[PDB]
């Protein structure tokens, strides 16, 4: 029975490989052969947000594109006013081990997660002017790698249990459990229509799930090492993956097989975070070369390099209006990068 | 020009900066010890007696006006290489090895010796790229179990290349030397080896001495003398 089941599973895998090969009539490379190149993009550190006293591990942009949230191992979740460098809030975390943070779309809550296997939802808007622990979602038995709010009451958290979980904040219970990854999921991105979410794991694969059905809609592979980063295309029908292998691969949801891979002979380290631009033309990935690189998604040619940190670029984020690029690194610094006319 | 409450928000940011720097100076004053090891290898009893009466378990204890944070990660069952970099910067790694585990085999797989698994874990954690200089306080636990286990069973099962004379002293010395042999980057990392005294108190005293030595070495490196 087990041999027969394994053989038929291999047969279906072969069938889907054949389908992917048949649908790959011509990759994205040739169709963008005559596309005007992006050009040399040069960027300036318009503002440096200092005040952290340990390695910054995560950073999420507010929906207003001005408020920022940064998490570091010192045990403090700092909310910055990026426009004026003012530090709005400094929430003291119960556990100093944090590797993910999120800004709720309404801005009323911030998520914090780490090696405590607990997602702490902090309520910013209170009658008393101190941020309090609104909720402590627990049930994961592995480290939380990424958290993303949906509608101020549902949050999706990917853990080290090779599982993601949809949490109803009010009840504090796990509405749906997304299982199927062989390795522990390291990043999590949400589609703009909040209908689906894609998460990549250490099994060198990224799975696309429906949030309400609770089952793995699609699975994408092609990487050789763990997926440390994931990011949705603003169209909502594509997503990019960064891995320990120095490659960023773009898979679209309608055609499972990958479209392009971005790599160079120079860079050997691992991608830590990936974020797209608003137009989707630029894909900004942090690396372990103590700097981040801006790739052109359509032509797979390195557009630029933002060499401004003395340690690993751990978190990358792009404002919802595409006016800034926050890059938080292990040197306890966040740099907001922008272009110059 | 700055608005009235824009100025007030700047002052609030300054106050938050003052609190941040005070908290950071308090945190840099404490000793962050990363405690990891094989399961049931005396980890629980070690944290017990040096408490002096899932996720990471944080244990706070003070000895001779020195704050100590202990970070147990045994609950985590995921790939450690995905989060071990979070501990880059610990003062020391308190490794715990069951000295009596030189005969018992792993429950999950019977083809791997438990002491061999501990040796593999020690090799992985000492030679990790994130701990090229962090010292290691190695604790050979279950000393009294080994004291009676040796006169029945020999080291040959655990280590075939063993001379003989099956007594406590030479067997413990051999195990200690074998463990420190995994330390490839000598002269930059230290392995403070201690045989735990389950009936005594000096177990935390040894950790205090090792931490003081590592603090002195780090200070010398900061001043550039070394």
């Amino acid at each position, epitope marked *: 029975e087990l041999d027969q089941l394994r053989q038929e599973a291999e047969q279906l895998k072969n069938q889907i490989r054949d389908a992917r090969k048949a649908c790959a009539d011509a990759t994205l490379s040739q169709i963008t052969n005559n596309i005007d190149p992006v050009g040399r993009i040069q960027m300036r550190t318009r503002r440096t947000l200092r005040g952290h006293l340990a390695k910054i591990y995560a950073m999420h942009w507010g929906t207003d594109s*001005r408020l920022l949230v940064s998490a570091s191992q010192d045990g403090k979740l700092i909310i910055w006013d990026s426009y004026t460098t003012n530090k*709005v*809030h400094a929430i003291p975390l119960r556990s100093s081990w944090v590797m993910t943070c999120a800004y709720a779309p309404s801005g009323n809550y911030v998520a914090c997660g780490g090696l405590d296997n607990i997602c702490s939802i902090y309520n910013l808007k209170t009658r*008393e002017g*101190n941020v309090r622990v609104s909720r402590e979602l627990a049930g994961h038995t592995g480290y939380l790698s990424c958290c993303r709010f949906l509608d101020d009451n549902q949050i999706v958290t990917s853990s080290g249990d090779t599982t993601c979980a949809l949490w109803d904040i009010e009840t504090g219970q796990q509405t749906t459990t997304f299982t199927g990854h062989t390795g522990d999921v390291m990043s999590l991105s949400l589609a703009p229509d909040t209908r689906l979410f894609v998460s990549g794991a250490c099994d060198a694969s990224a799975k696309l799930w429906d949030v309400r059905e609770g089952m793995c809609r699609q699975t994408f592979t092609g990487h050789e090492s763990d997926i440390n980063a994931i990011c949705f295309f603003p169209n909502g029908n594509a997503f990019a993956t960064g891995s320990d292998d120095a490659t960023c691969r773009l898979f679209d949801l309608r055609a499972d097989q990958e479209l392009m891979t971005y790599s160079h002979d120079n860079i050997i380290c691992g991608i830590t975070s990936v974020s797209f631009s608003k137009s989707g033309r630029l894909l900004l990935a942090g690396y372990d070369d103590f700097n981040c690189n801006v790739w052109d998604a359509l032509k797979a040619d390195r557009a630029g390099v933002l060499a401004g940190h003395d340690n690993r670029v751990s978190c990358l984020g792009v404002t919802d209006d595409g006016m800034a690029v926050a890059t938080g690194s292990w040197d306890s610094f966040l740099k907001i990068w922008n272009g110059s006319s | 020009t700055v608005s009235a409450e*824009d100025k007030a928000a700047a002052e609030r940011s300054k106050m938050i900066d003052k609190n941040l720097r005070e908290d950071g100076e308090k945190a840099a004053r404490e000793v962050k010890l990363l405690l990891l090891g094989a399961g049931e290898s005396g980890k629980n009893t070690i944290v017990k007696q040096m408490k002096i009466i899932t996720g990471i378990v944080e244990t706070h204890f003070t000895f001779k006006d020195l704050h100590f944070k202990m970070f147990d990660v045994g609950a985590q069952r995921s790939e450690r290489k995905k989060w071990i970099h979070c501990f880059e910067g610990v003062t020391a790694i308190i490794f715990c090895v069951a000295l009596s585990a030189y005969d018992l085999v792993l429950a999950e797989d019977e083809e791997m010796n438990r002491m061999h698994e501990s040796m593999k874990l020690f090799d992985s954690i000492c030679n990790n790229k994130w701990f090229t200089d962090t010292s290691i306080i190695l604790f050979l636990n279950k000393k009294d179990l080994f004291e009676e286990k040796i006169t029945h069973s020999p080291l040959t099962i655990c280590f075939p290349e063993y001379t003989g004379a099956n007594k406590y002293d030479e067997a413990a010395s051999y195990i200690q030397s074998k463990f420190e042999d995994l330390n490839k980057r000598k002269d930059t990392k230290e392995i403070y080896t201690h045989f735990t005294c389950s009936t005594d108190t000096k177990n935390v005293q040894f950790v205090f001495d090792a931490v003081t030595d590592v603090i002195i070495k780090n200070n010398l490196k900061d001043c550039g003398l070394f």
Partner: single-chain antibody
Amino acid sequence: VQLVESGGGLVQPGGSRKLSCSASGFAFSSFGMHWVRQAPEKGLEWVAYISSGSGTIYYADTVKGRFTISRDDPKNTLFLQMTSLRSEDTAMYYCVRSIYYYGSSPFDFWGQGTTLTVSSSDIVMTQATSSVPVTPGESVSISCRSSKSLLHSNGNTYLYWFLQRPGQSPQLLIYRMSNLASGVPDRFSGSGSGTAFTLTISRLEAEDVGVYYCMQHLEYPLTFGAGTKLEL
């Protein structure tokens, strides 16, 4: 959230007194404290202010030097020591909390106040509307006017609207001239630009009766408006 007050009553002129606001139910240290006075039959006027941590202390020109405003965070108290009370110091005194950060709500909660009775550059706010008859269910508009433009270069306009229904302390309706307060109905709204601003009530309720004040926060000598009174 409670902001009760103590100390006051009948005092002789030229003497000394101390007003104590005993805050409870919220974080005293994070909030800035304001002392705002109201003449017995007239409108409000800003008196004093201390920031978080007592870093900056501001006074009105009328009460400069005679008054000293301080805070005791460990005991969660706000003190106003007043010396040489003239005839105009007889007033209704309020302590107001105001936390200042991006997106905050300054002047959110007001205390009951202390009644003090003694024996016998700045921006101006004009509310020429004064008293207006209102019928429940109708839509009314209250106009406020500023001496100079309050639109700072950062993009914010700096009115705060307060409603004082008869009998007790005022409450915040609109902050930053266009942002709805917390715990207040949706019908209230604010609009305008430049120097003439408006507050619109789509439907009038039984509890919307009372006086309305507009206050600026651009230049720290805060000046309240005359106050437009809506009655049935």
